[PDB]
Design a protein around this ligand. Structure first.
Ligand SMILES: Cc1ccc(CN(C)Cc2ccccc2)o1
Ligand SMILES: *[C@@H]1O[C@H](CO)[C@@H](O)[C@H](O)[C@H]1NC(C)=O
Length: 341
């Protein structure tokens, strides 16, 4: 199991002012570190954050967190469950900031809630350097859903943090799972909700992307195909072609009109990944995968996701029989027989 540590700097807080934290299982024979960002949507004004505090409070507060968590999927220490990185040092960072890991605002006389996701990541990294991270060869920042978008927003800032602190030898990389969305036309909106969120959170985006889109337009950097070309750290993108959260925001729940909509969505997502050299994108209706225990089951062109990630590792030392770019071409959900049931 992974053991809970609340942050020693208690000014870095969850939404309600309680300390943020992380779950850790050390592997003293390994110089690889996996830091995973939890997901779970977000809230963008006082009224909908109040609702979330009533019935999704573990995503806003550490008051009720358990002392341990079992590592699953890519966070498992068993080679049978995790062929990729079973011997790595494992970290799970709970999502308690409701800001897609972008915020830098404290609770105050003028703010009912604190939104400190970007600062939580920074503080976890700093405290881990005293526990063994200082000796690392590779730090893989991973995440699912809102945490997958969080990887895209934060991987280059972690790389800059470690450089400025005097650790140029640690290679920082990103793994974004189910966080690559389209700002597309709905079947019957994310952009306006994210625009309001950034102002409510004092949200921050990567510097090069901010400089392209400029003031008032930072919401663009929450969309994978717009922020990814601005990033310097290596990033592997995992994305279902028919993501259930994408379909929810598109108001989709089969006649000709809906058939054409769904096929066009799959084609648009394929297009945005054409020039992403490390990626895994199966033609399935699902959401998240990398901390699911049966993440080993799905394959594209005969290659599993743990295998693709291992091939990525080798590429960062094309490879015969070890591909890193894997995108399905068939045009309908479950045209891949290995899709989750
Ligand atoms: C279960 C879950 C957590 C987060 C999400 C994705 N959801 C579309 C939120 C989002 C993320 C990034 C950008 C815009 C919106 O699903
Ligand atoms: C705690 O975190 C805050 C916000 O990031 C920072 O301003 C402060 O310097 C930190 N305290 C210490 C002792 O590092």
């Amino acid at each position: 199991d992974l053991r809970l540590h609340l942050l020693l700097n208690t000014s870095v807080t969850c939404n309600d002012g309680s300390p943020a934290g992380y779950y850790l299982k050390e592997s003293r024979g390994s110089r690889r570190w996996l830091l995973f960002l939890e997901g779970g949507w977000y809230c963008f004004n006082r009224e909908n954050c109040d609702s979330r505090y009533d019935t999704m409070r573990r995503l806003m507060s550490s008051r009720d967190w358990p002392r341990t968590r079992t590592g699953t999927g890519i966070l498992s220490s068993q080679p049978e469950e995790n062929p990729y990185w079973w011997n790595a040092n494992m970290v799970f960072i709970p999502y308690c900031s409701s800001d897609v890991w972008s915020g830098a605002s404290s609770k105050s006389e003028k703010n009912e809630y604190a939104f400190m996701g970007a600062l939580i990541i920074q503080e976890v990294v700093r405290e881990l350097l005293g526990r063994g991270l200082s000796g690392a060869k590779v730090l893989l920042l991973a995440g699912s859903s809102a945490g997958g978008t969080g990887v895209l927003l934060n991987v280059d800032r972690v790389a800059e943090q470690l450089e400025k602190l005097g650790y140029p030898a640690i290679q920082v990389r990103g793994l974004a799972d189910s966080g690559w969305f389209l700002d597309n036309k709905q079947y019957r909106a994310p952009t306006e909700a994210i625009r309001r969120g950034i102002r409510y959170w004092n949200g921050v985006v990567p510097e090069r992307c901010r400089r392209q889109f400029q003031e008032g337009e930072e919401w663009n950097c929450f969309f994978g195909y717009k922020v990814y070309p601005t990033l310097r750290s290596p990033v592997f993108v995992v994305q279902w072609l028919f993501d259930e959260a994408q379909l929810t925001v598109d108001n989709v729940h089969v006649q000709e009109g809906l058939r054409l909509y769904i096929q066009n969505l799959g084609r648009e997502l394929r297009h945005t990944l054409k020039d992403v050299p490390a990626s895994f994108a199966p033609a399935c209706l699902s959401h998240e995968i990398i901390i699911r225990s049966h993440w080993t089951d799905v394959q594209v062109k005969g290659t599993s996701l743990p295998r693709a990630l291992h091939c990525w590792d080798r590429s960062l030392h094309p490879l015969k029989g070890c591909p890193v770019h894997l995108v399905d071409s068939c045009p309908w959900p479950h045209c891949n027989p290995s899709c989750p049931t």
